[PDB]
Amino acid sequence: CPTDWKMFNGRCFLFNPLQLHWADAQESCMKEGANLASIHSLEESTFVKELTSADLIPSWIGGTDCQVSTRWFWMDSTSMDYADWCAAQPDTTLTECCIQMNVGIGKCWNDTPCTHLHSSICAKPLK
Ligand SMILES: [Ca+2]
């Protein structure tokens, strides 16, 4: 993997501490040939959590159901075969359609307004 990135299951990951809304976070990843990260297993979830410091900082990941409620998509076009929703989540309301991880005391996923500023996780295949 390139310098500051970390490898896991054929992909490289990076924690971007900069506070950005979802769209800016995705744009920031694209500048590096990446996408906000998709997560497909508890093993991957744990690996990414280890990139967010001892505080497990709330972070944007690349999933949303912003087009049609309840229809979730990852920006890297991989399948939605895993989720780590907090209790009662997701709300599926189009007004809070971007996935945020490391949310609350449970450090789980919560769909939230995409305009909120958060750190983020970027990922891209290993070359
Ligand atoms: Ca929510």
Author numbering: 4 to 130
Question: How does the study describe this entry?
Answer:
Many species of ectothermic animals, plants, and microbes living in cold environments produce antifreeze proteins/polypeptides (AFPs) to protect them from freezing damage. AFPs can also inhibit ice recrystallization, of which the large ice crystals grow with the expense of smaller ones, thus prevent cell damages during freeze-thaw cycles. It is generally accepted that AFPs function through adsorption of their flat ice-binding surfaces onto particular planes of ice crystals and prevent or inhibit further ice growth. They are the largest globular fish AFPs known to date, which are homologous to the C-type (Ca2+-dependent) lectin-like domains (CTLDs). Homology modeling and NMR studies on type II AFPs indicated that these proteins share the same characteristic fold, which includes disulfide bridges, α-helices and β-sheets, as well as a large proportion of coil structure. Both herring and two smelt AFPs depend on Ca2+ for their antifreeze activity, while the functions of sea raven and longsnout poacher AFPs are Ca2+ independent.
To understand the Ca2+-dependent ice-binding mechanism, we have determined the X-ray structure of the Ca2+-dependent type II hAFP at 1.7Å resolution. The crystal structure of hAFP, a first representative member of the Ca2+-dependent type II AFPs, has been determined. hAFP crystallized with six molecules in the asymmetric unit. Each monomer comprises two twisted anti-parallel β-sheets with an α-helix on either side. The overall three-dimensional fold of hAFP resembles the long-form CTLDs and is different from other types of AFPs. Remarkably, the additional two disulfide bonds (Cys69-Cys100 and Cys89-Cys111) are located at each end of the Ca2+-binding loop (Gln92-Asp114). The pentagonal bipyramidal coordinating sphere for Ca2+ is completed by a water molecule. Considering both the structural data and results of site-directed mutagenesis obtained here, together with the previous mutagenesis study of Ca2+-coordinating residues Asp94 and Glu99, which severely hampered the ice binding, we propose that the ice-binding site of hAFP consists of Asp94, Thr96, Thr98, and Glu99 that form a relatively flat surface to interact with ice.
